[PDB]
Amino acid sequence: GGMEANKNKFIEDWGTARENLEFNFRWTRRNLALVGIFGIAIPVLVYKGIVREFHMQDEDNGRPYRKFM
Amino acid sequence: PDTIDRLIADAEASYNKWRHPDPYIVPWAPGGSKFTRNPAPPQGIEIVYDYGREDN
Amino acid sequence: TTYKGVTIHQPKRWHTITGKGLCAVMWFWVLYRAKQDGPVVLGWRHPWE
């Protein structure tokens, strides 16, 4: 039956603006800082911590530290 | 009226400073403990039978 | 009973009896236990005395 939602123009515009955020990127200072912190620095720190955990396991086992990329 | 308006603004600020952290609200009033507990059904709502069928 | 314009019905007899009796049981239990284990709690004498 006639079950279609009563579409609101402003709600639809909000949805389209949300799904079209790729046009609004401008490499501003905030965007650059966020990319450099949460896109590079945090993954690098996580990788270093994981490698450190593996190397600590190697030291406790007495083996020779493993080789990672 | 200008000094009246400034007095009103100062009184509003003073009230906002010293208002009760959790003022009493009637339970069914907006913001009470009974607000929207068991509301009456909204009007103009229709339930449709036999929605999806292979043939009409 | 009504005083100015407001009447308040008496609470039910079983309500009053139950509440009063259970509180009386509580107070009598407290008094009996205080008599029995008063000095022990207050340090007057050990239980094996």
């Binding site: - | 609200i25 009637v26 069914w28 009033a29 | -």
Partner: protein, 82 residues
């Protein structure tokens, strides 16, 4: 639901129990400023007393709109939680 006659009687009792009000000249269709002579603050005090008696909460705009007995009875009778 609460009867309109009882609403009228309780509102009239609230209005009559006022210092600056002559109890004789209180009628379901009087105006606070005009007939029985009260200012705005007495009106909002009377509205607060009506709220306290009837166990209901009015938004501030409608509380200001309540400025006479007839309005008070009309609002309280229209409210379903009276």
């Amino acid at each position: 639901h609460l009867s309109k006659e009882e609403v009228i009687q309780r509102v009239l009792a609230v209005v009559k129990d006022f210092p600056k009000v002559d109890p004789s000249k209180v009628t379901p269709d009087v105006h606070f400023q005009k007939d029985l002579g009260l200012d705005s603050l007495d009106n909002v005090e009377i509205v607060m007393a009506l709220e306290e008696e009837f166990k209901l909460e009015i938004p501030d705009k409608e509380a200001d709109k309540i400025d006479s007995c007839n309005l008070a009875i009309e609002y309280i009778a229209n409210h379903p939680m009276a």
